[PDB]
Design a protein around this ligand. Structure first.
Ligand code: E82
Length: 228
């Protein structure tokens, strides 16, 4: 997260660190007891999910590391597009829920968030252009950018479909290692960070977030199959 501030420890109990070979790779969102939503591109080694965390390194009573039983990318995702960039991770077991570990309700009403609304995006991604990595979770409030603006040639040139939303990227933004994490509006998950342009913090290249409401059937069906 660029231009943000330290999160309150454990105040966003859905926040997950998706880890590869023991190192923070991408954010994720706990969406049910045994499932974390993240971004497919992140998994383009040993994948694990750290729940209950604030600091990546320091001892905390709620911190618990989970192995991943199955990684389920969206079936229409592809390495060369930004579309359908969602990933469902099934934990080795049901997470131990508590004040610090709780799923986040996600939006099922398929309607755009009003442009200009500030939504909250959190992560352990880089915090400056030098690539410095934070030990503790950061977050930032970003304004939703209207799709008609975001699709202009100078910005994302038509790539913002109805299943995507944009937020302003003027200095404040999501960045490397934030993909997969949440864009939360009014307390409900609206977006999942995707990497868009690799450029962060440049107003000319807004942040892109996958709209969860567009993917309700997929999430419901993956979870229902596993529950059979
Ligand atoms: N849209 C934003 C965003 C959101 C999620 C993931 C990323 C993302 C994912 C993978 C790598 C990179 C990357 O290395 N960016 C570098 C180089 C370009 C210019 C630039 C400017 C500022 C800071 C970093 C960088 C970024 C970017």
């Amino acid at each position: 997260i660029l231009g943000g501030r330290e999160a309150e420890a454990h105040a966003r109990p859905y926040m997950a660190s998706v880890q590869l070979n023991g190192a923070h790779l991408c954010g994720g969102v706990l969406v049910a007891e045994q499932w974390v939503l993240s971004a497919a591109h992140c998994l383009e080694g040993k994948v694990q999910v750290l729940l209950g965390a604030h600091s990546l390194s320091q001892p905390e009573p709620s911190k618990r590391l989970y192995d991943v039983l199955r990684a389920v990318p969206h079936p229409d995702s592809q390495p060369d597009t930004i579309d359908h960039d969602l990933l469902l991770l099934q934990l080795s077991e049901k997470a131990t829920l508590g004040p610090a570990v709780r799923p986040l309700p996600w939006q099922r009403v398929d309607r755009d968030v009003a442009p200009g609304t500030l939504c909250d995006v959190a992560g352990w991604g880089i915090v400056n252009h030098a690539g410095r990595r934070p030990d503790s979770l950061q977050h930032v409030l970003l304004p939703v950018l209207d799709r008609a603006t975001c699709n202009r040639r100078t910005h994302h040139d038509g790539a913002i479909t109805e299943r995507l939303m944009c937020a302003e990227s003027n200095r404040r933004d999501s960045c490397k290692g934030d993909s997969g994490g949440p864009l939360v509006c009014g307390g409900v998950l609206e977006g999942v960070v995707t990497s868009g342009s690799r450029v962060c913090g440049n107003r000319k290249k807004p942040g892109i977030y996958t709209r969860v409401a567009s993917y309700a059937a997929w999430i419901d069906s993956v979870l229902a199959s596993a529950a059979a």
